[PDB]
Structure 1
Amino acid sequence: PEPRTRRRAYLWCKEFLPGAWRGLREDEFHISVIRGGLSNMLFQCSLPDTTATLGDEPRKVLLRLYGAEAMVLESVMFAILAERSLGPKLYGIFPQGRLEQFIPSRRLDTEELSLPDISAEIAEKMATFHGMKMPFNKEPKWLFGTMEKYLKEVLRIKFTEESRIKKLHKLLSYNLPLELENLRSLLESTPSPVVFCHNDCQEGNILLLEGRENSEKQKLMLIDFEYSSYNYRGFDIGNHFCEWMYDYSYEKYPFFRANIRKYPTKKQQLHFISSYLPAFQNDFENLSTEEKSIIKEEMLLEVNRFALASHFLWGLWSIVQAKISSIEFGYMDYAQARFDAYFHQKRKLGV
C-alpha cells in the first residue's frame, strides 16, 4: 500500500485498538496486503515483535476496506455474529471499512469438502448458523428477488466484443424468463424451512483453524456473510453441494475447473445431513430409525431441488459480473458451466 493509505490504516489501528496500539508511532506500524483489488481489500496490520502486550489486545488484526441501507444490515450482522463468537471479533468500524480479529488459519480447498470429518463439521456449523435469530426480515424474499434483479440486468446487457455476444446469445436462447418461472413453480411446491442462511458456503469461505488440524469436530469457522439472509434452508445446503463441483484455485483462464462428477453421492449427502439434522433439531437423535429415515429421504429431494436455484442464481450473477467486474475471471464460461449443470440436474431429477 501507498504512503497515504498506510497513514489511514496506522491511524485506524492506533485510534481504535487498545493497549500497545495506543502509544505506537507511525515508524513502528506493520501492514501488508492479503488481498488487493478495488473491492473488499484485506490487509494484516501488526505490532513489532519487540513490543510487549499490555492487556487483552491482539498482536495481529485484519483490516478490511470496502472500496466500491446495505451497510447498516451487514454491520449489525457482523457485530452480532462476533458477540456470539460465530465470526471474527469486531474491533473497529468506520465508513471506509472495519478492523476484525485475524484468524490464523487457511481456506479449505475444493477437494477437502468431501473429507467425512470436514463435511460433518460444515454441516454442524451450518446448522448452528441456521439457528441464529437475527433482527432481519424473516420472509424468504432474497432468493427469487435476487434472481429477478440479476435477470433484469442480464436482459439489458449488450457486449461490445464479439465472442461475448455469442456466449450471451446462447444463454439467452434458453428463455431465461420462462425458465425462472419453471424453477419458482418447482420450488413453491418443495417444503423448506426458512432460516438464517449463509447463502455462499464455499471452500474459500471456510477457514481451517491453525493448531486444530487434529481436532475431529472443532477445526473450522464459516466466514464472509455478505450474502447472508433469511432463506430456504434447502438453498444453503444445495448451494454447498454444488460447490463440490467447482474449484476456483485453477491458475489459468478461465480460473476455475468444473467437475460434474464431484457432486456428492447419495452416501456423501446422507453423511452431511446426518450431521446437520441432530445439530439443527436437538431431539432428532431420539426419533425412531424409521422416522429419521423418512425425514432424511425428504430432505434429499429438498436440497437437490434447491441446488437448481444455486445453478440458476450464480449463472445469472456471473453474466452480470462479466459486464461490470474488475476481477480476472472467466465469468461467461462460469455462467455456461452453471447453466449446463442446471439442465443436467433437471434431467437427473426428472423435472
Structure 2
Amino acid sequence: DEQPEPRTRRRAYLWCKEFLPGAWRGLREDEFHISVIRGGLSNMLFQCSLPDTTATLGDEPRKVLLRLYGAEAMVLESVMFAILAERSLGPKLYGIFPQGRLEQFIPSRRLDTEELSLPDISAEIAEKMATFHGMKMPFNKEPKWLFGTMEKYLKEVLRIKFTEESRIKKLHKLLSYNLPLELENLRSLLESTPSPVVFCHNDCQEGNILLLEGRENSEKQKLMLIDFEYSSYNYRGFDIGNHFCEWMYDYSYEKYPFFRANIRKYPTKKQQLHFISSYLPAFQNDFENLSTEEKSIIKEEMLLEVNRFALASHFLWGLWSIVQAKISSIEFGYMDYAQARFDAYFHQKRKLGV
C-alpha cells in the first residue's frame, strides 16, 4: 500500500537491518518493503518485510510490525511489553529504541462490536482477562490508578475553556451535573463495594482484541488481547465493567461523530452470567469444586460489584474525552462521546437504584 515519506523509509530500513538478524543484516536499500498500516501524528504502524524471493538464514521473521511514538511511563510500558512477550501473552519484541519498536506481526483482524456478545467469543474474552488478572507484574499494587486518574482529569476539566461556541455549550451542560459532588458519591459507593486488586488491562474493547487468522474454528483459542498502554493494578470490577460498557459503543461508524452509542446493547443478566461463569473458574481455579449454593452467591455478588464499577468506566472515559476535545488532532466527536458516557452513567445509576 501507499508508502510512507522517504524520511521514514530510510530510518525504518536502518532500524530493521540493524535490529533484526539473519537475512535482514544483509539487506540493502533497494530490497526493503514497507507500507503504512495507520498514519497520524502519533503511534503510527508500518508493516516491513523481506523480498518474496530472499530466503531466511535461520528462524528470523519475514514480516514485522514497526510502531513509532511521535508524541517514566515509557520505561514501564516497555518492560511490560517485554514481559508479556517472554510469557507468550503478547507479540514478540524484536527491537527497542527511543523512536518506537519492532514487534511480531500477527496475521489477524480486530473484532467488531457486534461480536462481543457471541457466546464463544465472550467466554474466551473472560478466560483471557482472568489469566491476565492472575499474573505477577513488577508494578505498584496499591490501587490508586482509578481515583487518582479521575481526580487529575476532573481538575483539568474544571480549568478548560473552549473557544468555539458549540463546545462551550456542550461543556456548560456537562458541568451542570456538578461533577465534583458526583465524584464523591461514586467514591462512597465504590468504597463499600469490595473488589480484588489485580493486574488489569483497563481498556478491553473490541479494537484491542485480535481474531487470529487460521483459528476461526477453534472454540476457545482464537483470540489475543493487545495494547496494554493503560494497564495497572486496579479493581477487578473496573476491568470487567469497562468491558461490558464497550458492548454499547461502536467506533467503526464512518460519519461524524464517528461512533454510535446504544444503551439497549448492554449485556443482559443472562449474558453477564455467561461471562462471569467463564471468568471465575479460570481466575479462582478451585471454583468448580464449590457447592451450587456457594457459586450462585459468589456470582450474584460479582454482578453487583461489576455493574457498580461500570459507573467508573463512564465517569473516567467521560472526563478523559472532554480533555481530548481540547488537545487531540484526531477527528472524533469527543464532546458528544462525553455526553453519551454521562447519559449512560445516570441511566445506570437509575438501573441500580443508587
SS of aligned partner of 1:299: helix
Report Cα offsets for 1:145-187 as digits up to 9, x if no partner.
1101111111111011100000000000000111011101100
Paired with 1:64 and 1:36, the residues of 2 have a C-alpha distance of 10
- 1:344 aligned residue: 347
Paired with 1:31 and 1:173, the residues of 2 have a C-alpha distance of 50
State the TM-score, normalized to the length of structure 1. 1.00
Deviation at 1:56, TM superposition (A): 0.8
Unaligned 5+ runs, structure 1 = none
Deviation at 1:49, TM superposition (A): 0.6
Alignment coverage as a number of residue pairs: 351
- 1:136 aligned residue: 139
Paired with 2:42 and 2:137, the residues of 1 have a C-alpha distance of 26
Paired with 1:55 and 1:285, the residues of 2 have a C-alpha distance of 45
Paired with 2:232 and 2:128, the residues of 1 have a C-alpha distance of 16
Deviation at 1:5, TM superposition (A): 1.0
- 1:55 aligned residue: 58
Does 1:317 find its partner at 2:326? Answer: no
Does 1:121 find its partner at 2:156? Answer: no
Q: 2:289 aligns with which of 286, 291, 304?
A: 286
Does 1:109 find its partner at 2:128? Answer: no
Deviation at 1:110, TM superposition (A): 0.2
Paired with 2:37 and 2:150, the residues of 1 have a C-alpha distance of 31
Report Cα offsets for 1:265-285 as digits up to 9, x if no partner.
000000000000000011001
Paired with 1:320 and 1:40, the residues of 2 have a C-alpha distance of 19
Q: Percent identity?
A: 100
Paired with 1:290 and 1:208, the residues of 2 have a C-alpha distance of 36
Paired with 2:96 and 2:156, the residues of 1 have a C-alpha distance of 32
Deviation at 1:2, TM superposition (A): 1.1
Paired with 2:180 and 2:35, the residues of 1 have a C-alpha distance of 46
Paired with 1:145 and 1:62, the residues of 2 have a C-alpha distance of 34
Paired with 1:304 and 1:97, the residues of 2 have a C-alpha distance of 37
Paired with 2:23 and 2:76, the residues of 1 have a C-alpha distance of 32
Deviation at 1:326, TM superposition (A): 0.9
State the TM-score, normalized to the length of structure 2. 0.99
Q: 2:241 aligns with which of 238, 242, 250?
A: 238
Report Cα offsets for 1:25-50 as digits up to 9, x if no partner.
01111111111011111110011111
Report Cα offsets for 1:277-333 as digits up to 9, x if no partner.
000011001101110100000000000000000000000000000100111100000
Deviation at 1:215, TM superposition (A): 0.3
Report Cα offsets for 1:327-351 as digits up to 9, x if no partner.
1100000000000000000000000
Paired with 1:308 and 1:26, the residues of 2 have a C-alpha distance of 53
Deviation at 1:138, TM superposition (A): 0.2
Unaligned 5+ runs, structure 2 = none
Deviation at 1:7, TM superposition (A): 0.6
Report Cα offsets for 1:106-130 as digits up to 9, x if no partner.
0000000000000000000000110
Paired with 1:39 and 1:139, the residues of 2 have a C-alpha distance of 30
Deviation at 1:193, TM superposition (A): 0.1
Report Cα offsets for 1:238-267 as digits up to 9, x if no partner.
000000000000000000000100000000
Paired with 1:92 and 1:132, the residues of 2 have a C-alpha distance of 24
Deviation at 1:142, TM superposition (A): 0.3
Instruction: Provide the alpha-carbon RMSD of the alignment.
Output: 0.5
Paired with 1:154 and 1:25, the residues of 2 have a C-alpha distance of 51
- Structure 1: 4+ residue segments shifted above 2 A: none
Deviation at 1:53, TM superposition (A): 1.2
Paired with 1:18 and 1:291, the residues of 2 have a C-alpha distance of 55
